[model samples]
Target: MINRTDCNENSYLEIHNNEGRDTLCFANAGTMPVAIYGVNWVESGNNVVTLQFQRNLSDPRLETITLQKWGSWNPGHIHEILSIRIY
Candidate 1:
């Protein structure tokens, strides 16, 4: 039941399931994330989780983070998370 509300405004969410698959996304197609907490969830197995963030006007393509099964990452600049995807 790991959910968006279970995480911090500056952090991302990750979830677990008995099944071997799932992908829960929170996104705003053309802008930075605005209300991701509404229903955002990230699913993992073998723990491959990715986090996407947008800094007001950065390149946008390189703001991705791939965390280890038990590690953390910070982009070093201020970021507004725009999406979350699990594979």
Candidate 2:
């Protein structure tokens, strides 16, 4: 994964939250780079929840899925929390 400011703007992906920070994602060492079909995450920041990512590795013989969870908010505020789901 690349940042728009650091890499080419056309290829780099970005987070949707206007006040959140940008995140860079990477695949496992042996896993092939896959395409993310969809992502579902916390739309509101009022509640505490773990963010997860469902990755789809393009392999026909075997289905490779990775679920990564992120939590532990310091400020404990909706505007201060940023949930990014990268599949």
Whole-model Cα lDDT per candidate? 0.39, 0.27
In the order shown, the candidates' Cα RMSDs to the true structure are 11.3, 14.0
Give candidate 2's TM-score. Answer: 0.19
lDDT per residue (tens digit) for residues 2-72 in model 1: 23333332323343222213323322212223312222223332345666655454574435666555444
* Colliding residue pairs in candidate 2: none
Best candidate (score: TM-score): 1
- Clashing pairs in model 1, backbone N/Cα/C closer than 3 A: none
TM-score versus the correct structure, for each prediction:
0.41, 0.19
Q: How far does residue 22 in candidate 1 sit from its true spot (Å)?
A: 25
Runs in model 1 lying further than 4 Å from the true structure: 1-46, 56-62
